[PDB]
Write an enzyme that holds these catalytic residues in place. Sequence first.
Site, mmCIF file in Angstrom:
data_model
loop_
_atom_site.group_PDB
_atom_site.id
_atom_site.type_symbol
_atom_site.label_atom_id
_atom_site.label_comp_id
_atom_site.label_asym_id
_atom_site.label_seq_id
_atom_site.Cartn_x
_atom_site.Cartn_y
_atom_site.Cartn_z
ATOM 1 N N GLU A 179 -5.407 8.162 -4.775
ATOM 2 C CA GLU A 179 -5.251 9.363 -3.906
ATOM 3 C C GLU A 179 -6.175 10.512 -4.352
ATOM 4 O O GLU A 179 -6.697 11.290 -3.536
ATOM 5 C CB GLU A 179 -3.793 9.910 -3.896
ATOM 6 C CG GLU A 179 -2.669 8.904 -3.673
ATOM 7 C CD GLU A 179 -2.616 8.324 -2.263
ATOM 8 O OE1 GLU A 179 -3.653 8.323 -1.542
ATOM 9 O OE2 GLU A 179 -1.518 7.841 -1.870
ATOM 10 N N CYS A 196 0.907 -1.265 0.000
ATOM 11 C CA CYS A 196 0.000 0.000 0.000
ATOM 12 C C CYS A 196 0.893 1.246 0.000
ATOM 13 O O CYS A 196 1.455 1.606 -1.055
ATOM 14 C CB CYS A 196 -1.070 -0.074 1.162
ATOM 15 S SG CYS A 196 -2.369 1.287 1.696
ATOM 16 N N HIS A 197 1.077 1.876 1.164
ATOM 17 C CA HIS A 197 2.062 2.953 1.307
ATOM 18 C C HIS A 197 3.376 2.467 1.940
ATOM 19 O O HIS A 197 4.335 3.236 2.046
ATOM 20 C CB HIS A 197 1.475 4.156 2.070
ATOM 21 C CG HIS A 197 0.373 4.838 1.322
ATOM 22 N ND1 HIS A 197 -0.956 4.528 1.514
ATOM 23 C CD2 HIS A 197 0.408 5.777 0.349
ATOM 24 C CE1 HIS A 197 -1.692 5.254 0.695
ATOM 25 N NE2 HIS A 197 -0.888 6.020 -0.023
#
Length: 241
Positions: A170, A139-140
């Site tokens: 985003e 993910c991040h």
Amino acid sequence: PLPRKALLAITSAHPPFWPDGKRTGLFFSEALHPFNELTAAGFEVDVASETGTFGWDEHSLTQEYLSKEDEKVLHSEHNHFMEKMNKQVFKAGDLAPHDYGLMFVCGGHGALYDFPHAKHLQNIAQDIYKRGGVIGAVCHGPAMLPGIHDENGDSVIKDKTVTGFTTKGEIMIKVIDKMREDHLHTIADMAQTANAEYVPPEDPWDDFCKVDGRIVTGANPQSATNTARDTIKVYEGIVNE
Ligand SMILES: [Cl-]
Ligand SMILES: [Cl-]
Ligand SMILES: [Cl-]
């Protein structure tokens, strides 16, 4: 021999972030699902953040992002995962890196704040990788990877294919303005700066994972289980050499 012991790396950042005012932090299912997969495969697991503390991403605690099983774990005191998260989170710099054969890096937007410069977590990962071990990131989570270096001082993802949370996503969830305000880079821009090749899923929430040598990445919360599974598959091949 690479120890069958994993470091579950979590963000220590949890600022107000979302348009409704809620805080970001560690994405709940992105810690729980990999923990479950690692445990099922016989790994001991230590959890660490750069500071030793964390908060849950508040959106990750809503029904939109919790399965029926997830919610039962969340509201259960005696549960081994919740006991670890409540009482056993280490400051990353205290841990001896040689104890681990694999790192799994969890996501949540908090990762954008502290992972690029999380030098103690990055040191643990560099040591794992140098000993021939595996790094998975969802993910991040991949925001940590540019700062994890090989013998030549290049990122371990140089010339590698990676995935991670899309810039499309985003924009759709309306956090891109906040990211720019806080001087955060998108995962795709971080990957490119590290000379990796970023590949997005066809749609932003698809279960989508990439394996390139001993670097495994996943795109989003729906990719977490398979990112952990792929990371374990890579590990199993190395210890059977
Ligand atoms: Cl805000
Ligand atoms: Cl220990
Ligand atoms: Cl994108």
